[PDB]
Write a protein that binds this ligand. Structure first.
Ligand SMILES: CNCc1ccc2c(c1)C[C@H](CNC(=N)N)[C@H]2NC(=O)C(=O)Nc1ccc(Cl)c(F)c1
Ligand SMILES: CNCc1ccc2c(c1)C[C@H](CNC(=N)N)[C@H]2NC(=O)C(=O)Nc1ccc(Cl)c(F)c1
Ligand SMILES: CC(=O)N[C@@H]1[C@@H](O)[C@H](O)[C@@H](CO)O[C@H]1O
Ligand SMILES: CC(=O)N[C@@H]1[C@@H](O)[C@H](O)[C@@H](CO)O[C@H]1O
Ligand SMILES: CC(=O)N[C@@H]1[C@@H](O)[C@H](O)[C@@H](CO)O[C@H]1O
Ligand SMILES: CC(=O)N[C@@H]1[C@@H](O)[C@H](O)[C@@H](CO)O[C@H]1O
Ligand SMILES: CC(=O)N[C@@H]1[C@@H](O)[C@H](O)[C@@H](CO)O[C@H]1O
Ligand SMILES: CC(=O)N[C@@H]1[C@@H](O)[C@H](O)[C@@H](CO)O[C@H]1O
Ligand SMILES: CC(=O)N[C@@H]1[C@@H](O)[C@H](O)[C@@H](CO)O[C@H]1O
Ligand SMILES: CC(=O)N[C@@H]1[C@@H](O)[C@H](O)[C@@H](CO)O[C@H]1O
Ligand SMILES: CC(=O)N[C@@H]1[C@@H](O)[C@H](O)[C@@H](CO)O[C@H]1O
Ligand SMILES: CC(=O)N[C@@H]1[C@@H](O)[C@H](O)[C@@H](CO)O[C@H]1O
Ligand SMILES: CC(=O)N[C@@H]1[C@@H](O)[C@H](O)[C@@H](CO)O[C@H]1O
Ligand SMILES: CC(=O)N[C@@H]1[C@@H](O)[C@H](O)[C@@H](CO)O[C@H]1O
Lengths: 335, 335
């Protein structure tokens, strides 16, 4: 445990809030990348127990706190009012760096899970570009597995322990509200989704014996975790995944049972102003959505699942720390 | 006639040279791109003389000139030395867009040829994403035919005219240099290769009546065109294709006579420092390959062939504007 510091390419002329925060909270990235190679090792890592995720989480909370300022913030029964200006919003990559004398080891095993022994291990002073993408169910704009899609879990036996599925091939999703003022929609190519769910399916089948592997929409709870919720240009999108996370892996093939059109899948999305916050326990009310075409062109780089002679899997999320472990499946701060 | 402009998803924080170049040469990509399609049209096309190809060619020459700077540049008996640092190299998509009031119509007939009449025609302002992949014999990371494999030629009865075989199913190829330092190798699944060459064979049979259709390694001449030459992470790979382009198509079946092992084809590759330039007429000398595992996992999306009882086809290439025509088999700049 140490007190880290962020490094970025933030410009102090951008009125984009991530830059506005990073220019006063981080350090200019340094053209100084010496990755200490090493092949004499055995370090055991645990992506599920690592303070880096916590400090990252905390100053991402600071970022959001002084950037996206809600009109009302209702916490503990007390309502706190302030100004609601819509701002420029799009995540910039943040490197996490260890201070004087403190190093950040690094795993290079391309099939490494997160928990256990790793050995082809390098070392750094600063980490690799990471975007503070806040989302549920679908991990957006992250790293891709260099070889093949991998399953991460603090334990896979525990049905209530979140599964992070690190993908390989990015799945472009295009969410948009056209020029109802709150209704939007997302578009995703169906072929590549069937594709990806056959990889997810067959690996889950590698690690669950010989059973039918169903994919279904989340049980219940708040809209934040029952839908693919994300932020696009300061607007909070809640997009439906009932005709997405939907299919059956049997016989070694995956059969999609979600609806489709022209070879594309369209998610019904809604922009909301009242949001169950991820930082704290409370609700934030924002101003109505801005005028015009509100579109995000994103790439799915991972999944967040939850398990219950058949085994059903369901989109998860809610705890953004696990979002941070998708990219902090780790390193290791060490001395 | 016009001078176009590029549009891309280049990041100003990336130190990858395609991003470095595009960010100062291109325009932030448009995501309001609505194909106003038409159905009372018939326009003629000619992928084999289209100036968009040489605008792209000139611009990619610019990119390579300002990015990959060789230690030595020998042209016309005069040598030019400069600093040759190793860089990060991975092609990003480039949309080519027409300026004010001037448009880019589009062909929609998927069984389309490249030369002649076409009727289902749309029109856009910007082309689809095209990655400037510089290679010979094999076209990498291109678009796939939506339907069935297409044979393209300026004309097919001219044996000196390059033939572009637009594939349907991509064929995965994994070139790697393991941790001799310049010795590398490529892996390709044979069954997929047999499979592809059977309809390459069948349609080349459709265009050449009742001949035995053989596939053999190239002529001779410079290694760039006698080998599958390409660029992986700044390193110039020359890969042997004597056991790849090798087969007999007869009586309706393809027959692979190239050597294999465990059902896989392994190409013998070498990383060279002395390169015959594709941009200009001259040679370039680069620094020795970097340390570590150099891996490129690519998809074969097209072929570059040349024709001579029997008709024989050999891998071609060398002139990269044909590589740009593979993706610019086209559209059209029109008013
Ligand atoms: C089984 N999983 C456990 C689980 C489940 C749900 C949640 C947690 C843990 C933590 C958090 C509790 N806070 C609260 N209830 N007010 C709650 N998450 C959120 O409200 C949340 O992410 N909102 C949110 C905001 C913005 C965007 Cl863009 C977004 F995509 C989502
Ligand atoms: C019938 N065919 C005619 C024909 C034949 C060969 C060539 C041309 C035309 C053009 C070009 C001439 N330039 C020269 N002779 N210096 C020459 N091509 C190249 O040198 C070339 O592609 N190099 C190259 C570099 C890097 C990578 Cl990664 C690569 F895959 C290839
Ligand atoms: C590496 C890559 O781009 N895609 C891989 C593919 O090569 C592999 O065969 C498949 C097996 O699950 O997983 C995915
Ligand atoms: C979720 C998952 O894949 N867990 C496994 C774990 O059971 C195993 O002990 C470890 C070995 O390094 O690899 C990982
Ligand atoms: C994974 C871990 O650290 N602890 C336990 C594991 O040993 C046990 O097998 C499992 C059974 O549900 O519950 C958890
Ligand atoms: C959490 C959520 O939004 N669930 C909805 C469900 O109520 C609805 O019946 C279905 C059909 O559109 O779409 C999904
Ligand atoms: C979610 C579930 O269990 N079953 C759904 C069903 O409700 C829905 O009508 C159908 C349409 O996509 O897809 C399946
Ligand atoms: C959900 C999300 O952040 N998506 C972003 C999008 O806003 C941005 O335009 C694009 C390029 O930077 O990267 C991705
Ligand atoms: C479209 C596809 O995936 N594969 C096609 C197949 O449908 C077609 O019958 C065959 C004919 O050569 O070419 C390949
Ligand atoms: C290489 C090739 O296939 N060429 C033919 C061309 O001879 C013919 O005129 C055209 C008709 O649209 O179809 C194509
Ligand atoms: C097809 C075309 O456009 N031009 C000519 C064609 O007229 C001629 O018959 C052929 C013979 O070599 O050469 C080519
Ligand atoms: C252009 C080229 O590399 N040709 C070679 C050839 O000289 C060699 O005999 C054969 C066997 O490995 O492989 C191929
Ligand atoms: C290139 C040619 O004409 N015939 C080749 C032969 O030279 C080679 O020994 C054999 C092994 O792959 O494959 C065939
Ligand atoms: C020759 C070439 O450009 N190959 C690329 C490879 O480097 C890259 O890893 C992959 C995914 O982007 O696409 C392909």
């Amino acid at each position: 445990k140490t007190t880290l510091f962020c490094a970025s390419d933030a410009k102090a002329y951008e009125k984009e809030v991530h830059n506005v925060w990073a220019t006063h909270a981080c350090v200019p990235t340094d053209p100084n990348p010496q990755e200490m190679v090493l092949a004499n090792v055995t370090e055991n890592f645990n992506m599920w127990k690592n303070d880096m995720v916590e400090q990252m989480h905390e100053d991402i909370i600071s970022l959001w706190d002084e950037s996206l300022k809600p009109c009302v913030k209702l916490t503990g029964g007390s309502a706190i009012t302030q100004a609601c200006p819509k701002v420029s919003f799009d995540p910039i990559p943040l490197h996490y760096c260890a201070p004087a004398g403190f190093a950040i080891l690094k795993c290079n095993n391309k099939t490494f899970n997160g928990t256990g022994p790793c050995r082809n291990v390098s070392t750094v002073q600063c980490t690799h570009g990471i975007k503070p993408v806040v989302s549920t169910q679908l991990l957006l704009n992250g790293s891709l597995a260099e070889e093949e899609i991998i399953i991460r879990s603090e334990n896979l036996t525990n049905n209530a322990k979140t599964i992070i599925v690190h993908l390989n091939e990015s799945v472009n999703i295009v969410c948009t509200r056209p020029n109802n003022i709150r209704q939007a929609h997302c578009n995703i190519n169906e072929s590549k989704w069937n594709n990806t769910l056959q990889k997810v399916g067959e690996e889950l089948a590698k690690h669950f014996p010989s059973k039918t592997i169903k994919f279904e929409p989340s049980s219940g709870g708040d809209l934040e975790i029952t839908t693919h919720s994300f932020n696009c240009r300061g607007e909070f999108f809640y997009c439906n995944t009932s005709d997405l996370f939907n299919g059956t892996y049997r016989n070694g093939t995956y059969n999609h049972t979600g609806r489709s059109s022209n070879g594309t899948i369209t998610l019904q999305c809604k922009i909301k102003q009242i949001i169950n916050m991820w930082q704290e326990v409370g609700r934030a009310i924002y101003a109505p959505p801005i005028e015009g075409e509100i579109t995000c062109n994103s790439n799915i780089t991972g999944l967040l699942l939850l398990r219950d002679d058949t085994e059903t899997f369901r989109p998860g999320g809610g705890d953004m720390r696990d979002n941070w472990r998708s990219e902090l499946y780790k390193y290791k701060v060490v001395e």
